[PDB]
Ligand binder design. Structure first.
Ligand SMILES: NC(=O)c1ccc[n+]([C@@H]2O[C@H](COP(=O)([O-])OP(=O)(O)OC[C@H]3O[C@@H](n4cnc5c(N)ncnc54)[C@H](O)[C@@H]3O)[C@@H](O)[C@H]2O)c1
Ligand SMILES: NC(=O)c1ccc[n+]([C@@H]2O[C@H](COP(=O)([O-])OP(=O)(O)OC[C@H]3O[C@@H](n4cnc5c(N)ncnc54)[C@H](O)[C@@H]3O)[C@@H](O)[C@H]2O)c1
Ligand SMILES: NC(=O)c1ccc[n+]([C@@H]2O[C@H](COP(=O)([O-])OP(=O)(O)OC[C@H]3O[C@@H](n4cnc5c(N)ncnc54)[C@H](O)[C@@H]3O)[C@@H](O)[C@H]2O)c1
Ligand SMILES: NC(=O)c1ccc[n+]([C@@H]2O[C@H](COP(=O)([O-])OP(=O)(O)OC[C@H]3O[C@@H](n4cnc5c(N)ncnc54)[C@H](O)[C@@H]3O)[C@@H](O)[C@H]2O)c1
Ligand SMILES: O=C(O)CCC(O)(O)C(=O)O
Ligand SMILES: O=C(O)CCC(O)(O)C(=O)O
Ligand SMILES: O=C(O)CCC(O)(O)C(=O)O
Ligand SMILES: O=C(O)CCC(O)(O)C(=O)O
Ligand SMILES: [Ca+2]
Ligand SMILES: [Ca+2]
Ligand SMILES: [Ca+2]
Ligand SMILES: [Ca+2]
Ligand code: NA
Ligand code: NA
Lengths: 412, 412, 413, 412
């Protein structure tokens, strides 16, 4: 259970060492451009007040407007938001999209708030950060605990202060300027990333078994698209519980059952298992799709997967990376594998600022090209620097940010 | 040495209980409106880069634009800036000036920077916070390690972004719209505060002995104006050392000597003394004028003063308060005694927005009037609530802030 | 016959710089204006045909505060003149110890040749072209030659379309639109105060002395009227139409009525026509130029008969004339002091506007007197410190104050 | 050498008389929209101050945002900037790109300034004009003495005041939103223009001899691309000297030599020649790529070229035009032949505001289309008005600006 920012800074310092970065540049790159904490106090439906703290860490904007989602989750805190924001900086650079990195969140439990309370909280948070975000400054998006409806409320409230600004947030509903393909983009990108990786070993998804932790926006689309590529999704978990079927779970039936009952439990097409054995389940490919830090020094040694594809942000800490590398496990890093979301967010933003939307086929074709080119550039760094996939992506992104920073200069 | 924010929060909660504040209002008043941390990187004179982190905590704005200084000191960190900012909210309310509270700082050692480096650092910090401050939003000022020249640079840089804005900062040089009386205002207010307290016992400054920790903007003017009221300043210290004379130090001579040599303890008109027994020196009145938290559980039992007048922000922690109370020591609290600075800053801001400067005698007569009225209001709270001077001031300030907050309301 | 106005003003500035011992880099920075702006101003005439003018606003220096200075409509407006006038505003505001820097603007046009509707359109288009450059705490215009309170009303009205009601963006306004009591008369009244201050140093006063006035507009009429009411004998007056003299003194109130009724000073029953180019060399105790700059120059200065010159116009005496006149024993009270009653009461008008509350005229004129008395005292101090004449006493006072503010602001980016 | 603005105004008045332009419209089109001169004072690396005067002439914006580069050169003065700005107005209209004309510069010698000094000067200039330029107002670019790195500093400083604004300047580094093709664009467009001209005579570049004055952004690319189309570049000069080779200079070798030594002198593949006989050197096509006014009444009669293609701005004054016309020399005018720079600048601006960059193949294909179309419209004007190439282009541009001006109207 390592501190999230300590783990991410360890990876950053490793990448900086591989690159030979100057120490003063390295320090500047670590320090976020701006960290914001704001009081967010709303009346509950019964009129009583509740106060939350909202966060937006704006890590780096050398390569363009900052980009990253907003997490509503009880474990949101400054270290977590800082770690996620720094990862967005490297992720956007690896994807070669013209963004820097940011992240925000509120430490709350959304399932304990009514829809009207969530809307008020979202609008108050927007009132408290509207002057610090913007189409060409910092563009939020969903993350854990938020979704396209959350984004609609941000858009609606932001637009009161600045006029109609569809490009100020991505992950919007289609009817409010959202992009076709954005809902499925992170899971679909995970599929593309997994296919690029497996192809290096002469393999494809068909017939392989997959274990998925988390069953939300990322986990459901990754599970559904892997299954439709012929993969055997043999175990899935979420906050409610876990299920397994060694012949592969009928993911579409699982989605129906989850929507209808609110639970993975009592699914007819699988067996209840202990959630805390999900990550060490037998499989070809393990895909964490929920919280970070879940693969650590305590359980990494029990991981049975041959490949790990990080759909979640920072699911594997650096202690686990070492334990797993010794076990022969290949790890496709978060800052590449889950970048389908922010890549299609970039396409959404482009569509909005161009005032004209794309067909879904074009969105998904561009997503594939970007994921293919990013993986190609990662492999080049891995070869240049004789390093593993995580450090190939991390050095790629750090190097691109350092270049843009140096071009912009340092005089006042 | 107790954590500064923990110490201030202990005092705040006690005050809230005295007032019977609802627990949700109590929590809201603790949480700052907005906390900002920004990277401040400059080239040094030799061209090499140095990176600092700048802070501005905007604690509360219910009563008006936020107000508070900018500290350049190596121990600046988020807990310190948050504690100072919260104290500004109570202090402005105690003074009955139409401001809320804020504070900023950079963790740096100004003596280690050249004048050109300090100017670049000040201008970059201003570039990083200009969108967060403003004449009717948040109005900075000096504190430890900054002075009127610093404020000139903030004014000059801010005005590039928003046009000429003299009232955006106070403590300015007279020639750029500063107020007569502001340089001396905190020390002069300390004198008025001390006179008010002493008169409750039939006493005057004339003939009493005083010990002063620190010899900067606050300590020099407190010592000089006490001396000119006939007080005997028997010991003085600063970062370089300490000097004592039980007959009274010639403060004007000491000021000349300090300016000529940069040190205190080789002064002809006194004897060197160990700086670490200054606070426990025999005196009628002890006036800390340097860092916070210097009267604590380790040394409070050895304090020999009959009265403590808090010129520094939070020089006495709550452990020390309890120890000193049992010894019969009477403590005039920071949020009253040092409020001359922010009160004359209010007058400076008024003069700027009115476009027309006042004579110094008007500034100082208004300062006296405000300090006499605030002391009376503190005494009223002390009598109503049967509480000590610190809690009289804290409850006065918190109550005023809570009242403004409740009038503004909570709907979105 | 005149020196170039900017060369003349820079020669005075360089001399003041030398007296003060200014560093050469600071000297150069203080010469260079903050910002010079030239804009096309094209309007339809009443018959629909187009006419194009060039408008100027030179923002010379803002170290001491919002820039301040009038707008001139006159055929001889050009960049050198506007730059010279703007630089003089910087020193004048500093001499007066008001919290402003210096700017000036203008249009090279002949207002007499435009209809009122054409003048209004031109003024509104000029405002449209510079509204983003000026502002209550940035640059605050005012009248000058060829413009008046009605001109300022149109600037206010057009500017407020872009920025909301902004009374303090311009001074010299009509009283009924936020103007200050006392501003119409302020420059002439300040000229009297300044003259009284100077004469008192010689144990004299206005009563019984003789005065010659060149120009009979906002400045010249009020200087002449108020001098006359203090017992001065105004023995010659000119404007663009002609010149009249009466060695026993002209009835200024009668002359005002005659000029109003006929549009001319000529054929006034209470004086004698004279050659307008002998006006400045007429016998008198005190000569007060109240029209164009550079009118005392190499060609006529040696024939000046006045004992005192009080500069109500901006830069009426060039440095060649200064030197000639100094050898003749003529004492010259400089424009950047003597005519500062206008900008001083403009400051008061601006204060009243931003404060939302207007003053009585008695308060305005009492404050004007205080400011003019204090400024003269400070000029005398500089004269004594630097062993220099009145012009250099004022110039060094202003330059020193601007340099001090500049140094405090600093130079890093 | 004639006055630059007098020469350009003479060409403008000539074009207006060909068009029968209304005399009032003519006068308005001559008068620039807005001329700006600003103080630019910086500390040097040793801390001493230096003051420059920065200029931005915004000549005409009837057809759209104004466009034109920034020159750092000791001969920069108001007449030169006014002349270049008026030429940008006609050039943009000839190219049929939706821009008006502007130009800027600072009278300085960049080679006498350090890189940090150049950066501070550039940033201060930007501070002084940021309120007067903008994506839809006035978009600068490089010119003599500035380059992509200069533009990066303008972008960076401007974005402090207005947020990230990549389209505010063109000629940016690729890694900061620059366009592929922009660096080579002016020289490449010179090639296209020359090819369109020569084709009118059944000629092409291959085999012909060229002389080039200047060897910077424009001269190096023009010479390189001409040589790669089989042209014989027989003489080249820059500020350091001149070389000739009647069999053709190896331009790639000359570039490498120039880079390594900083001089064209002592190039192993050419002979020194007197650089003030470069323009009168025997050749088929003469291409000035440096200062304006270099062909004048004194040397035009000695010109030996058959064609002059004006890559520099206003290299030929009207006295020379007449002398050369009598000699049968054909002159392809600057406002057409060098328009590849601004045309690809337009594509860069488009890419930036669209948030999505183009392939270089597309950039260069569009450049060719635009240059071919502009030449066709110039020939149409030459035939309609029985005038030479300069007046065909000048009348095309003036007529397009006059039309847009008339549509906008004149009431307040
Ligand atoms: N949404 C995106 O576009 C996107 C993009 C890239 C990366 N990510 C990352 O993907 C991960 C999932 O995000 P999401 O958008 O799917 O969130 P979501 O809120 O839609 O779903 C989160 C899922 O995780 C489950 N979960 C929560 N705690 C769990 C626990 N302790 N054990 C097991 N399951 C648990 C929830 O029940 C739910 O199934 C996060 O790390 C997020 O930062 C999201
Ligand atoms: N300046 C104001 O208007 C103002 C207003 C209210 C309260 N305060 C408080 O007053 C105190 C002093 O502020 P200032 O403006 O005088 O600062 P300053 O920087 O002008 O001077 C600080 C002084 O403290 C001394 N000092 C520092 N560390 C010391 C140590 N360990 N022991 C002894 N002396 C030490 C320095 O040597 C110097 O004499 C601070 O708590 C500040 O927050 C300042
Ligand atoms: N108005 C102010 O508040 C103010 C303030 C300070 C200084 N000034 C200066 O005072 C002078 C006059 O300004 P004003 O406001 O009275 O202008 P105005 O337009 O009201 O009047 C100008 C006067 O000068 C006369 N004049 C013009 N050319 C002349 C010539 N060749 N010979 C003789 N007389 C001539 C006109 O006929 C008219 O009488 C100018 O130098 C101006 O810059 C004006
Ligand atoms: N850069 C563009 O995109 C662009 C676009 C259109 C037109 N132009 C025009 O092209 C010309 C060159 O611009 P650039 O971008 O190549 O500039 P640059 O600074 O990159 O290079 C200028 C070149 O001219 C040479 N030079 C200077 N003075 C000279 C002299 N007296 N004799 C001979 N050579 C001399 C320099 O040594 C250098 O080789 C200028 O007229 C410019 O306005 C530039
Ligand atoms: O779409 C975006 O802007 C961000 C997507 C994400 O923030 O969830 C992420 O990549 O972690
Ligand atoms: O004058 C001000 O606004 C600042 C006062 C201060 O921050 O130094 C303080 O009261 O601690
Ligand atoms: O009142 C003003 O602001 C300006 C007065 C004036 O510009 O005419 C001047 O002093 O020359
Ligand atoms: O690319 C631009 O916008 C301008 C190109 C240039 O200014 O150098 C020119 O055409 O002269
Ligand atoms: Ca950073
Ligand atoms: Ca609060
Ligand atoms: Ca200047
Ligand atoms: Ca025009
Ligand atoms: Na009409
Ligand atoms: Na240096």
């Amino acid at each position: 259970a390592m501190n999230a920012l300590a783990a991410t800074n360890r990876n950053f310092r490793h990448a900086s060492r591989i690159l030979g970065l100057d120490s003063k540049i390295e320090r500047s790159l670590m320090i976020p451009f701006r960290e914001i904490k704001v009081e967010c106090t709303i009346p509950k439906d019964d009129g009583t007040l509740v106060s939350y703290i909202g966060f937006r860490v704006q890590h780096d904007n050398a390569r363009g407007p900052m980009k990253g989602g907003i997490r509503y989750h009880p474990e949101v805190d400054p270290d977590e938001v800082n770690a996620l924001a720094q990862l967005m900086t490297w992720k956007t650079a690896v994807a070669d999209i013209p963004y820097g990195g940011a992240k925000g969140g509120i430490g709350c439990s959304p399932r304990d708030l009514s829809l009207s309370e969530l809307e008020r909280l979202t609008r108050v948070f927007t009132q408290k950060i509207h002057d610090l975000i913007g189409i060409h400054t910092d563009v939020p998006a969903p993350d854990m605990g938020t979704n396209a409806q959350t984004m609609a409320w941000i858009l609606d409230e932001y637009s009161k202060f600045h006029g109609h600004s569809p490009a100020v947030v991505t992950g919007k509903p289609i009817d409010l300027g959202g992009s076709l393909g954005r809902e499925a983009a992170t899971g679909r990108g995970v599929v593309f990333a997994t296919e690029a990786l497996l192809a290096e070993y002469g393999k494809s998804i068909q017939g392989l078994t997959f274990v998925i932790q988390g069953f939300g926006n990322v986990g459901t689309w990754a599970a559904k698209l892997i299954h439709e590529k012929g993969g055997k999704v043999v175990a899935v978990s979420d906050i409610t519980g876990a299920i397994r079927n060694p012949e592969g779970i009928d993911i579409n039936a699982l989605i129906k059952h989850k929507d209808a009952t609110g639970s993975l439990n009592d699914f007819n097409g699988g067996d209840a298992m202990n959630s805390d054995e999900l990550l060490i389940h037998e499989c070809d490919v393990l895909i964490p799709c929920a919280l970070g830090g879940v693969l650590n020094k305590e359980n990494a040694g029990d991981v049975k997967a041959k490949f790990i594809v990080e759909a979640a942000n920072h699911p594997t800490d650096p202690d686990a990376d070492e334990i797993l590398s010794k076990k022969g496990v290949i790890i496709l890093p978060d800052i590449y594998a889950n970048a389908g979301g922010v890549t299609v967010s970039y396409f959404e933003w482009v569509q909005n600022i161009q005032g004209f939307m794309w067909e879904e086929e074009k969105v998904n074709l561009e997503l594939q090209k970007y994921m293919t080119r990013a993986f190609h550039n990662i492999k080049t760094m891995c070869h240049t620097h004789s390093c593993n996939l995580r450090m190939g992506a991390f050095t790629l992104g750090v190097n691109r940010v350092a270049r843009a920073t140096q071009l912009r200069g340092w005089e006042a």
